[PDB]
Amino acid sequence: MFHGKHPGGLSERGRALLLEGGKALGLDLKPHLEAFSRLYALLQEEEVVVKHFLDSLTLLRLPLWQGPLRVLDLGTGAGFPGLPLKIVRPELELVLVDATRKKVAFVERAIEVLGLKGARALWGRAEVLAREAGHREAYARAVARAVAPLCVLSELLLPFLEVGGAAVAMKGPRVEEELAPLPPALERLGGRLGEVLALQLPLSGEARHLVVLEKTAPTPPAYPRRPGVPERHPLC
């Protein structure tokens, strides 16, 4: 079984892995195979990418994605988790931000080639964008998948959220140390810790955590601090 090859897309084995992984998450990815297949072609190992599509799709284990919400994907890199999110939740109005121009260019290109409507890539720094009226507290959701610690991520994500909004920080197997000093820092930003959801990835069984930050009150004018300062002098 799964012998079929595919020059410009996911092989038969890759498609079947994505579908199986999808089902384990509770998703039917059949209507979306071609979009994911085209995304893979574009990223070009196969198994590794399908694992990234699926990790991105774990966001759907939280019921945060109903309707025409404005969503910010921060530090999206090659477009994760934002692009998989947008593929399966097409009503979301997505802005995918990255500080690296080539990444942004890749994302624009992916959006064009997948024919995604209501998604845009934006080149810029979180610290700068969050002090613009167009972006500050303009989003219902924000997401990031990043090595930058929760304390740092909170300062970068929270200022984008309208009150009542929520951010998801996608994290790996270990979150205890990053979480421990967090709640005081959230308070200063107008945030509250929501849920920390532990889960296992579909095919590998790797431990993951989704850390939900709730936006409780407006972020004071002092945050976020200047470009690179949150990273160098974390709030916690």
Exactly one of 89, 125, 192, 225 binds ligand SAH (CB under 6 A); that residue is 125
Among residues 75 and 194, whose Cβ is nearest to ligand SAH? Answer: 75
Residue 155 touching ligand SAH (CB under 6 A): no
187 is in an annotated binding site: no
User: Is there binding between residue 146 and ligand SAH (CB under 6 A)?
Assistant: yes
Minimum distance of ligand SAH from residue 16's CB (angstroms): 23
Cβ contact 64:215 at 8 Å:
no
Q: State the first-to-last Cα distance of the chain, in angstroms, to the nearest integer.
A: 52
Residue 145 as a binder of ligand SAH (CB under 6 A): the answer is yes
Q: Does 44 bind ligand SAH (CB under 6 A)?
A: no
99 makes contact with ligand SAH (CB under 6 A): yes
- Cα–Cα distance, 71 to 143 (Å, whole number): 8
Whole-number Å distance between alpha carbons of 157 and 136: 10
Mode of pairing for the β-strands spanning 93-98 and 119-123: parallel
Angle between helices 46-57 and 12-25 (to 10 degrees): 20
Interface with ligand SAH (CB under 6 A), residue from 98, 155, 178, 214: 98
- Shortest distance (Å) from residue 148 CB to ligand SAH: 6
Chain breaks in the chain (C to N over 2.5 A) after: 44
Query: Quick one: DSSP state of residue 10?
Result: -
Mark the binding-site residues for S-adenosyl-L-methionine, compressed into ranges: 75, 80, 98-100, 126-127, 145
- Judged by the rule CB under 6 A, the positions of this chain that interact with ligand SAH are 75-77, 80, 97-100, 103, 125-127, 145-146, 156
